[PDB]
Design a binder for this molecule. Structure first.
Ligand SMILES: *[C@@H]1O[C@H](CO)[C@@H](O[C@@H]2O[C@H](CO)[C@@H](O[C@H]3O[C@H](CO)[C@@H](O)[C@H](O)[C@@H]3O)[C@H](O)[C@H]2NC(C)=O)[C@H](O)[C@H]1NC(C)=O
Ligand SMILES: *[C@@H]1O[C@H](CO)[C@@H](O[C@@H]2O[C@H](CO)[C@@H](O[C@H]3O[C@H](CO)[C@@H](O)[C@H](O)[C@@H]3O)[C@H](O)[C@H]2NC(C)=O)[C@H](O)[C@H]1NC(C)=O
Ligand SMILES: *[C@@H]1O[C@H](CO)[C@@H](O[C@@H]2O[C@H](CO)[C@@H](O[C@H]3O[C@H](CO)[C@@H](O)[C@H](O)[C@@H]3O)[C@H](O)[C@H]2NC(C)=O)[C@H](O)[C@H]1NC(C)=O
Ligand SMILES: *[C@@H]1O[C@H](CO)[C@@H](O[C@@H]2O[C@H](CO)[C@@H](O)[C@H](O)[C@H]2NC(C)=O)[C@H](O)[C@H]1NC(C)=O
Ligand SMILES: *[C@@H]1O[C@H](CO)[C@@H](O[C@@H]2O[C@H](CO)[C@@H](O)[C@H](O)[C@H]2NC(C)=O)[C@H](O)[C@H]1NC(C)=O
Ligand SMILES: *[C@@H]1O[C@H](CO)[C@@H](O[C@@H]2O[C@H](CO)[C@@H](O)[C@H](O)[C@H]2NC(C)=O)[C@H](O)[C@H]1NC(C)=O
Ligand SMILES: *[C@@H]1O[C@H](CO)[C@@H](O)[C@H](O)[C@H]1NC(C)=O
Ligand SMILES: *[C@@H]1O[C@H](CO)[C@@H](O)[C@H](O)[C@H]1NC(C)=O
Ligand SMILES: *[C@@H]1O[C@H](CO)[C@@H](O)[C@H](O)[C@H]1NC(C)=O
Ligand SMILES: *[C@@H]1O[C@H](CO)[C@@H](O)[C@H](O)[C@H]1NC(C)=O
Ligand SMILES: *[C@@H]1O[C@H](CO)[C@@H](O)[C@H](O)[C@H]1NC(C)=O
Lengths: 97, 379, 249, 31, 49
């Protein structure tokens, strides 16, 4: 009966499917974040480098640097919290075993 | 590398990550459209007579080659302020469409020409858009357009019911009802003609003098651009990651025969990260894809420093058929390369381990590497 | 030349539903296998689009461009010939002209004195072309589609936008076989040309060059909204869903 | 993802070895 | 304290600032990208004309 039940419905393994999906979604948003202007005139560094003279080019880069650095910090903090809950579940699993 | 990363003079046994490894490009490739005729910028800058500021003329320039150096190096221009553009990279960068807006104003209203300011001509007959990109060029032309009796062919629009749209041009001469009562005819009490005439004479001082202005309204790189400077094109090579240049698209990566079908109005193919992923040659109508050539991290496996100073090297995620191509002829981010001597090489799912000897005896995992392989310092 | 004929010939103005029409290629970018979303002026689906039919004799009515106009054409033997653009239409202000005459399409923007009842057979559209700022000629746009002999009717969707002094045109050809109504399905538009008009236009009228044929159009009012576009793996639009029609959308 | 510097790493314990653990555990139990 | 003294045109005074572009700036006198210090300028036509 257990083999039949596991072979029938997919709503049982949501616990592991969510572990996969949250990571995929977070990293996907991290990639998407490279397309925003963050207040600049272009989202492509090559363009900001090709255009403008050396002084202003760097100034626009700074706006980009600040925004992307903020995005990285947000992603890292969320990963730290997620890892703690994964380890809490791992300790529970070890005790049950 | 490990000691410098740890910022200490002793290194404990284990695996340590260091600076990432990335293959440098070898040669430069530039591909501009091979049109040759020069753009008649002289026909706009040295044009006989411009139209009035209320009826500024617009000319389209395309299918030609420009030169902005001769414009930036000319000392005649009094003000040259650019928006998201620089004359230094103008004989290089390309242009979707080049439109020359030509008109004449008073010297005091020169500041109003820039986007975002206001005034009697700025809000009435010429406003630039909020996100305007381009560059405006202005200079006095009193000795060219002033007459002793007064120049009266130049007029501006003084009254309108509501402010105009960007680049809007109003030619109507409807009489403005400044008073509350309606009026008609040529003129009436508190019914002014919308245009006001100037009085340019040689005796006027600075600020009130006429300033000949010419403006460009180009847009960039979001369309199949057609016009740019005299930068000469070279040949293209394949399967080697180089810093290519297609119509001002600076970049670096290995280019390979693609299979996507751009529509005739489409020139670029963009990925999730809003970066270019495929390119069409501006000289032949084939389509190619761009991939960043191989890169990855480097980890250094060492035992106790007091025990020995011999080390190994591992590249995460790098198939080491490339590292023979990673010969120290071109530039490489890691300077040290003597370890690629060979026959001390082994491949893992985690990358290629170089400088260590493969055996069959199994043991407890001393230093974890990945995919079940573990290294250990042993006799 | 001008002859002023009769009246507006009753009021055949009715209503019909625009199931899944009113979208064009937003930008000159090739994308594949991505559900991209764009926030700009587009026609919403199921929009209560004004209906007309050239059921005889008929005239061309004057309609606005508040936030611009989507236009569609259900045509046979290419009765469609262009459109009339303007704000005052009395040569006091600049109004734009498009006519696809026998040789080719020509576009001309001047202070035209549009006739009260413009019709073709004859180029009786304006009496005066006093002050001009633009004039363009090309090859004709009457690209008849595949199949030939009109086995399926021709759908030639159109969008005309006036943003910050730029006049943009998009186009598409597709055959249709639905007798009276909007063919059920999806489509988009290829951008054709940007026109530098920079003139304030409020209201439009149509041409209908005149000759045993009938044809009808829709009027869609373009509106600034958000729409989700389902690109396939080839780079052509295969489906679309409104962001602001119903809660499910 | 990998093109922008986002790299994934392989786990130390492969699935075959994890299967060896679980088989050894249940065999030891049942015997 | 190092005193660099020279004479230029009125319109090319703008080029004296670091990071500027022009004939004089590109060919004979550019200040460093991270220049510290400052320039002193004044018309001297009635002294050197
Ligand atoms: C483009 O043309 C439009 C049509 O002329 C124009 O709209 C018109 O604007 C005027 C002045 O703003 C209005 O005149 C009325 O204005 C107020 C209402 O705001 C009334 O109280 C006054 O008595 C006066 O009659 C017109 O009513 C209005 N017409 C329409 C059809 O909207 C636009 O302003 C023009 N666009 C630009 C940028 O100028
Ligand atoms: C369709 O509309 C077209 C424009 O509205 C119109 O083009 C007209 O073509 C004629 C002949 O080519 C031009 O007449 C001039 O042609 C040459 C041009 O260099 C001159 O040498 C001649 O002396 C003569 O002046 C017109 O100028 C041109 N129209 C405009 C506005 O410029 C087509 O003829 C129209 N087709 C039909 C069938 O009506
Ligand atoms: C994207 O465009 C592709 C090319 O236009 C198109 O591929 C084409 O697909 C059809 C049918 O899917 C193929 O026709 C043949 O398909 C099979 C063989 O796979 C045969 O059994 C059929 O009888 C028929 O002969 C075309 O050969 C194929 N052409 C190419 C160049 O791939 C895709 O279908 C398009 N995809 C979408 C989602 O629009
Ligand atoms: C590392 O790269 C080499 C070559 O770059 C791969 O060898 C290829 O293997 C496939 C399948 O066995 C063959 O079809 C190819 O012909 C081989 N390449 C060459 C040049 O002969 C090797 O598989 C790669 N390693 C991994 C783990 O994928
Ligand atoms: C366009 O239609 C109008 C109808 O409003 C015609 O205007 C009349 O023209 C006659 C001359 O034939 C005058 O005597 C009338 O006074 C006009 N009526 C108005 C209200 O002005 C006009 O003739 C038609 N156009 C042409 C070219 O005939
Ligand atoms: C619009 O057209 C009218 C009609 O020709 C132009 O008015 C003429 O302008 C010239 C040159 O200034 C004068 O010599 C004529 O006397 C004017 N005609 C009349 C009846 O007064 C007008 O200049 C044109 N406007 C533009 C902006 O081109
Ligand atoms: C205009 O003419 C002068 C000399 O007649 C020339 O130096 C200048 O380069 C010309 N303008 C342009 C844009 O070439
Ligand atoms: C570039 O040159 C080649 C051969 O020299 C030619 O076939 C091609 O048409 C040229 N490009 C354009 C845009 O004309
Ligand atoms: C390394 O060896 C030296 C003797 O050569 C010893 O003094 C030192 O304590 C050792 N380091 C550690 C961490 O044990
Ligand atoms: C390990 O044993 C295999 C035999 O299955 C042999 O082919 C291989 O060469 C051995 N490893 C080494 C390092 O010799
Ligand atoms: C469209 O509007 C007409 C009247 O303007 C109305 O009779 C009809 O029911 C409406 N249809 C829809 C689908 O809104």
């Amino acid at each position: 009966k257990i083999q039949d039940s596991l072979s029938s419905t997919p709503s049982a393994l949501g616990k592991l499917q969510d572990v996969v999906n949250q990571n995929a979604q977070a990293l996907n948003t991290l990639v998407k974040q490279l397309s925003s202007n963050f207040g600049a005139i272009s989202s492509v560094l090559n363009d900001i480098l090709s255009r403008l003279d050396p002084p202003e080019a760097e100034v626009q880069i700074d706006r980009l640097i600040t925004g992307r650095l903020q995005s990285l910090q947000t992603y890292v903090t969320q990963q730290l919290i997620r890892a703690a809950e994964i380890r809490a579940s791992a300790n529970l699993a070890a005790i049950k075993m | 590398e490990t000691k410098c990363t740890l910022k200490s003079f002793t290194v404990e046994k284990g695996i340590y990550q260091t600076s990432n490894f990335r293959v440098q490009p070898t040669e430069s490739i530039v591909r501009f459209p091979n049109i040759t005729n020069l753009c008649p910028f002289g026909e706009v800058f040295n044009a006989t007579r411009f139209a009035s500021v209320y009826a500024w003329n617009r000319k389209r320039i395309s299918n030609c080659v420009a030169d902005y150096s001769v414009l930036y190096n000319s000392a005649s221009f009094s003000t040259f302020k650019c928006y998201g553009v620089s004359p230094t990279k103008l004989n290089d960068l390309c242009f979707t469409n080049v439109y020359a807006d030509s008109f004449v104003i008073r010297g005091d209203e020169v500041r109003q020409i820039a986007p975002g300011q206001t005034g009697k001509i700025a809000d009435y007959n010429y406003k630039l858009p909020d996100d305007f990109t381009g560059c405006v060029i202005a200079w006095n032309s009193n000795n060219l357009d002033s007459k002793v009796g007064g120049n009266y062919n130049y007029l501006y629009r003084l009254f309108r019911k509501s402010n105009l749209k960007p680049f809007e041009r109003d030619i109507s001469t409807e009489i403005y009802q400044a008073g509350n009562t309606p009026c008609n005819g040529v003129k009436g009490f508190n019914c002014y003609f919308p245009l006001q005439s100037y009085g340019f004479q040689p005796t006027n001082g600075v600020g009130y003098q006429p300033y000949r202005v010419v403006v460009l309204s180009f847009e960039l790189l979001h369309a199949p651009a057609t016009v740019c400077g005299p930068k000469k094109s070279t040949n293209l090579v394949k399967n080697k990651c180089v810093n290519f240049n297609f119509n001002g698209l600076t970049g670096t990566g290995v280019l390979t025969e693609s299979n996507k079908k751009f529509l005739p109005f489409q020139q670029f193919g963009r990925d999730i990260a809003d970066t270019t992923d495929a390119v069409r040659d501006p000289q032949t109508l084939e389509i190619l894809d761009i991939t960043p050539c191989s890169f990855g991290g480097v980890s250094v496996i060492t035992p106790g420093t007091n025990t020995s100073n011999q080390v190994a090297v591992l590249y995460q995620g790098v198939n080491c058929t490339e590292v023979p191509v990673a010969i120290h002829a071109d530039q490489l981010t890691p300077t040290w390369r003597v370890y690629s001597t060979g026959s001390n090489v082994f491949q893992t799912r985690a990358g290629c381990l170089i400088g260590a000897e493969h055996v069959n005896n199994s043991y407890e995992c001393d230093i974890p590497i990945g995919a079940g392989i573990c290294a250990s310092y042993q006799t | 030349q001008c002859v002023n004929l009769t009246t507006r010939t009753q009021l055949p103005s009715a209503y019909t539903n625009s199931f899944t029409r009113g979208v064009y290629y937003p930008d000159k970018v090739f994308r594949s296998s991505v559900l991209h979303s764009t926030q700009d002026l587009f026609l919403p689906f199921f929009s209560n689009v004004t209906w007309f039919h050239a059921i005889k004799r008929f005239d061309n009515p004057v309609l606005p461009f508040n936030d611009g106009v989507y236009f569609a054409s259900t045509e046979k033997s290419n009765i469609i010939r262009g459109w009339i653009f303007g704000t005052t239409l009395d040569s006091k202000t600049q109004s734009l002209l498009i006519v696809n005459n026998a040789t080719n399409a020509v576009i001309k923007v001047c202070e035209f004195q549009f006739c009260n009842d413009p019709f073709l057979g004859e180029f009786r559209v304006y009496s005066s072309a006093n002050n001009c700022t633009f004039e363009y000629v090309s090859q004709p746009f009457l690209m008849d589609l595949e199949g030939k002999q009109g086995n399926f009717k021709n759908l030639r969707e159109f969008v005309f936008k006036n943003i910050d002094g730029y006049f943009k045109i998009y186009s598409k050809h597709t055959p249709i076989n639905l007798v009276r109504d909007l063919p059920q399905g999806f489509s988009a538009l290829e951008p054709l040309v940007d026109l530098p008009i920079g003139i304030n236009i409020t209201r439009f009228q149509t041409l209908y060059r005149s000759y045993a044929g009938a044809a009808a159009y829709y009027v869609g009012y373009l509106q600034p909204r958000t729409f989700l576009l389902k690109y396939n793996e080839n780079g052509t639009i295969t489906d679309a869903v409104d962001c602001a029609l119903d809660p499910l959308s | 993802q990998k093109f922008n510097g986002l790299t994934v790493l392989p786990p130390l314990l492969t699935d075959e070895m994890i299967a060896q653990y679980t088989s050894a555990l249940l065999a030891g139990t049942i015997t």
